[PDB]
Amino acid sequence: AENTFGWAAMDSSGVLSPFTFSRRATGEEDVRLKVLYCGICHSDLGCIKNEWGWCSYPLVPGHEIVGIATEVGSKVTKFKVGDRVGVGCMVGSCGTCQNCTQNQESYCPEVIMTCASAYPDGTPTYGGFSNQMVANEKFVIRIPNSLPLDAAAPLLCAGSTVYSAMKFYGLCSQGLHLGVVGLGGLGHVAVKFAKAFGMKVTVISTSLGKKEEAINQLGADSFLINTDTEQMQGAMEVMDGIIDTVSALHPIEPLLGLLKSHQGKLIIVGLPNKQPELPVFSLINGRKMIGGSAVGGVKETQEMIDFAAEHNITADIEIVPMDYVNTAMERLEKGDVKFRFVIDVENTLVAA
């Protein structure tokens, strides 16, 4: 309870305040980094307000971490002091599963999340709303020189997720017609990756005063209003797949109507509070599918970030200081951001 400082929630109220704690010494396989930036994710919002009821306190959120290695263990092969490194959703895993062994490490039942979790021996994991971070080399990402740290930080989670989903479900080929539902953090990262894979992108939305970022800033080929039951119906059976990034309850059936029969896939990556109805009749009669995806494993996250570098993909961010974080959270509940918050941890997190 000393050698590291950050901000933490104590309550399901999710209100965050200064908090001091200790990180482990750097083991033979560990990298320590000074945290320079930490993205804010809807997962952090859910965790601090204990949306799903598992979370215990004090809770230091943050899992979109970028920084500079300050210390490497002797057994470390990938990294040296000074490297630009990242840490995403995970800091640990089983190490011996079927999942852990074929780089699907986001599915060992003993996965150790970067924030709001604990190791086997009971010690709680504190995320990147803090001045420094320690992680096994195995969960550390190299940030390419040609991407800025602040705008790469959110790729560690939003980017890994959309890329892993597009790869896994076979929606990463030129010409394919991809729909993206929601135009928040994930939504805009999804559009950038889809355009870089060569797919025609239609954004599906509820905010018509966002068409303009969708078409012009983000470069999407088409724009649809969720409820515009007349334009939607003109877009029926058109799309090879849809990535749904909305973390709010919303109707699934109209999205299914946009999908190609005996082909189209609705891939869900936003996790809401309540669950919608399963459109059994549409799935059966159109021979359509719904699959879910979460963040990809560490190799796939490295591959994602190298792909983003090759294609100059960056998240569209708003830099904020640490003591704005509570306001930032309130703004996330509203979608009021373009598109992702990033905390400037180095310049604005200070010791109490």
Largest Cα separation within the chain, whole Å, is 63
Q: How big is the site for Zn ion, counted in residues (CB under 5 A)?
A: 3
Nearer to Zn ion, 157 or 181 (CB): 157
- Shortest Cβ 44–Zn ion spacing (Å): 7
Which of residues 157, 218, 252, 322 is near Zn ion by CB under 5 A? 157
C-alpha pair distances (Å), 63 with each of 19, 27, 112, 284, 319 = 17, 21, 12, 38, 16
Residue 14 region, left (φ>0) first, then alpha (ψ -120 to 50), else beta?
Answer: left
What is the DSSP-derived secondary structure letter of residue 147?
S
Report the residue number, 43 or 164, with the smaller CB distance to Zn ion. Answer: 43
Considering the complex, state which of residue 43 and residue 245 has its C-beta at the smaller distance from Zn ion.
43
Can you read off the two tokens belonging to residue 313? 């993909």
Give the HSE-up count for residue 153: Cα atoms under 13 Å, Cβ half-sphere: 30
Q: In this chain, which of 41, 147, 165, 201 binds Zn ion, going by CB under 5 A?
A: 41
Which of these segments, 154-162, 163-171, 275-283, 285-293, binds Zn ion (CB under 5 A)? Answer: 154-162
Q: Least distance in Å: CB of 41 to Zn ion?
A: 3
Q: How far is the CB of 14 from Zn ion (least distance, A)?
A: 16
Q: Applying CB under 5 A, which part among 152-160, 194-202, 205-213, 298-306 lies near Zn ion?
A: 152-160
CB of 86 to Zn ion, least distance (A): 12
Of 60 and 176, the one with the shorter C-beta distance to Zn ion is: 60
Q: Which of residues 65-124 bind Zn ion (CB under 5 A)?
A: none
Nearest residue to 138 via CA among 72, 81, 67, 40: 72
* Number of residue whose CB is nearest Zn ion: 41
* In the complex, least distance from residue 42 CB atom to Zn ion, rounded to whole angstroms: 7
43/301 with CB nearer Zn ion: 43
Q: Shortest distance, CB of residue 96 to Zn ion, whole angstroms?
A: 27
From CA 192, how far away is CA 41, in angstroms rounded?
A: 18
Nearer residue to Zn ion within complex by CB, 87 or 256: 87
Task: Provide the terminal-to-terminal Cα distance of the chain, rounded to the nearest Å.
Answer: 14
Strand extents, DSSP E, the chain: 4-9, 16-21, 30-40, 64-72, 84-87, 90-92, 112-113, 117-118, 124-125, 132-136, 140-142, 177-181, 200-205, 222-225, 241-244, 265-268, 289-292, 317-320, 340-344
Q: Which stretch binds Zn ion (CB under 5 A): 105-113, 151-159, 201-209, 258-266?
A: 151-159
User: Given the structure tokens 């992108």, which residue do they identify?
Assistant: 201
Q: Does residue number 40 form part of the binding site for Zn ion (CB under 5 A)?
A: no
Q: Given the rule CB under 5 A, which residues bind Zn ion?
A: 41, 43, 157
